[PDB]
Amino acid sequence: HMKSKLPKPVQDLIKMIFDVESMKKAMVEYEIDLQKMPLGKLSKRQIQAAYSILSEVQQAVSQGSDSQILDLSNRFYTLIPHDFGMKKPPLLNNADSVQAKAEMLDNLLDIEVAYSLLRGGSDDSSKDPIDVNYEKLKTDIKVVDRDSEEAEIIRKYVKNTHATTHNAYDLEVIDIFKIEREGECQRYKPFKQLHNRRLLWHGSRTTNFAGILSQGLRIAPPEAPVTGYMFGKGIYFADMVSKSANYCHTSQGDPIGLILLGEVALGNMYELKHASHISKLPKGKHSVKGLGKTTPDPSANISLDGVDVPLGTGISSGVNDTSLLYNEYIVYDIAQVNLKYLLKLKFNFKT
Ligand SMILES: O=c1[nH]nc(OC[C@@H]2CCNC2)c2ccc(F)cc12
Numbered sequence: 001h002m003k004s005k006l007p008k009p010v011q012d013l014i015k016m017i018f019d020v021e022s023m024k025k026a027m028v029e030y031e032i033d034l035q036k037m038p039l040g041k042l043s044k045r046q047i048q049a050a051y052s053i054l055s056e057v058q059q060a061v062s063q064g065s066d067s068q069i070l071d072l073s074n075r076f077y078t079l080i081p082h083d084f085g086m087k088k089p090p091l092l093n094n095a096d097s098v099q100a101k102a103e104m105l106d107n108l109l110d111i112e113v114a115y116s117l118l119r120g121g122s123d124d125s126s127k128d129p130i131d132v133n134y135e136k137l138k139t140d141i142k143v144v145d146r147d148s149e150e151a152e153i154i155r156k157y158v159k160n161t162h163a164t165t166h167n168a169y170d171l172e173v174i175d176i177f178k179i180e181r182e183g184e185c186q187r188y189k190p191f192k193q194l195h196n197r198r199l200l201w202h203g204s205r206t207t208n209f210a211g212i213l214s215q216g217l218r219i220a221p222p223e224a225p226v227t228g229y230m231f232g233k234g235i236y237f238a239d240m241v242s243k244s245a246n247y248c249h250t251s252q253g254d255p256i257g258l259i260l261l262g263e264v265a266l267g268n269m270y271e272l273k274h275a276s277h278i279s280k281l282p283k284g285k286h287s288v289k290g291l292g293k294t295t296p297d298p299s300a301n302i303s304l305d306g307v308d309v310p311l312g313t314g315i316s317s318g319v320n321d322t323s324l325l326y327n328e329y330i331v332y333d334i335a336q337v338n339l340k341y342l343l344k345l346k347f348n349f350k351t
Helices: 008-017 020-029 044-062 066-079 095-119 129-135 149-160 184-191 206-215 241-248
Strands: 139-143 169-181 197-204 235-237 256-265 269-272 287-290 292-296 302-304 307-309 314-316 324-326 328-331 337-349
Touching (some): 008 129, 008 139, 008 169, 008 206, 008 256, 008 337, 020 095, 020 206, 044 095, 095 206, 149 169, 149 337, 184 256, 197 206, 197 235, 197 241, 206 256, 241 337, 256 328
Parallel strands (some): 197 307, 292 324
Antiparallel strands (some): 139 169, 169 337, 197 256, 235 328, 287 328, 292 314, 302 307
16 A cells, blocks of 8 residues: 555554454453444444433332343343353343443444444555545544643643542553544534633543544433433543543553543533433533532643643642542533544553
């Protein structure tokens, strides 16, 4: 092939995000049976149907036994095959079981997107597949220069917002990319001047990123159980890098993660301390803020292209009986996000 003139970091990013074997590995991690439900047989309607059954299982547990539950739990396993051999699979009988399976289905949706991009499309040997795959993202990806002002600000954000309670690892920024999802800026226009626009973190596993860059960050579908998400079906962000970085699900086999920085249009925040499984905001509110016990020092907010960057070190928020150790931000309309940066991170696991 012609060999590809994309910068080396952008090429390594494309290789990571389209890696078929990482997809399979993520699926086997969820205890999916690849013999019965392989990567290519995965589809939107089957995932949607699984989401619905999980909503039924949600319904049964809300209103209380292990007898009428058994049936609903088995029906989940009928739609998404799990690898339990000659089995009896574990009973899905509580809220933890529902959260956990709904998070799996979120990820399968993005893996299906990634694989459909690979299998749709044309085959041409004289093109570098790195170039072919890049183009399917419909995203401009540029390397940010290590000495720029924006680089300095990003690395400070990363440097100051690592929580003491997440000290089992630390992070080094390997590559910073500036990203522009096609049409996203246009989508964001109504919100672009809104008050309380903040640059915030979103971590996800690497096998979601092809999906995220082609479709943007998305809200879970109507079929998904709203109870499987602490603040219901929105798009979730943190102001502490380590809280988002935990969602990369890195470890000691797969050490590199990917994390986003988006401009999020929060406007009037609906401030909450505990789980609230809403599907719409109170009139007048534009976001939810889950109130952390600790917050980036508000005095240290700095500005980057007109957006607040809450990069102060963590201090007491003053909030008392909250479920959350750190802040969480949730929007409920996809147009309130404009993705700005993508970081490739190395996790140094101290344990
Ligand atoms: O960076 C983040 N990535 N993903 C998060 O959540 C993914 C699942 C959907 C919301 N609950 C779990 C998530 C939830 C809270 C938060 F502050 C950050 C993040």
